[PDB]
Amino acid sequence: HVPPYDVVPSMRPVVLVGPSLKGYEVTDMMQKALFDFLKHRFDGRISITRVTADLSLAKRSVLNNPGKRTIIERSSARSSIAEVQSEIERIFELAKSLQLVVLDADTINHPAQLAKTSLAPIIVFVKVSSPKVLQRLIRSRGKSQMKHLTVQMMAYDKLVQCPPE
């Protein structure tokens, strides 16, 4: 029984999905340069918020109030769902202030992961044209990324095979 209307922020937050995986050097500078230009060119009208916490557990049809208080000692009361739900409305006040905001979420790396939630944000896709250049792009960082390179390619094509729409 999906409602005809859904509550969304008045102003769309912007989330940038990295080439392979966030939290790693190749993606981090791949995101950092765009973040700087958002700060500089649009200074005085854009506010940037970084959330280290997760955002993929944003559900609205699970229960009336899962873990309403921290003293219940419930499984979800002491879990991480408390702060994730508390950060959901944090975006809303920024949207009502008309000053543009982005989502520096370090956990989301795929568009549908944050598509069923009430955020429904603007997803910006930065991608390398081919996997061949990306592999040697990782090589430029150093031997540290060489330990972690293998899973950094599987995260890329899974995001690539997602339809452009």
């Binding site: 390398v128 250049v133 040697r136």
Partner: protein
């Protein structure tokens, strides 16, 4: 003697050789090497 013997024969030699080099370029084995060269350059441009 100079015009026919030296300048006219030099014209045919350049003509025949140039035709042969054009045909050699479009050989299957030679085209594949160029296609590898073109792809390798495209990577370098994007990587830069």
């Amino acid at each position: 003697l100079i015009i026919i013997g030296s300048f006219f024969m030099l014209n045919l030699v350049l003509g025949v050789l140039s035709g042969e080099f054009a045909k050699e370029r479009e050989r299957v084995e030679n085209r594949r090497a160029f296609l590898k060269l073109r792809r390798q350059q495209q990577i370098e441009r994007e990587l830069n």
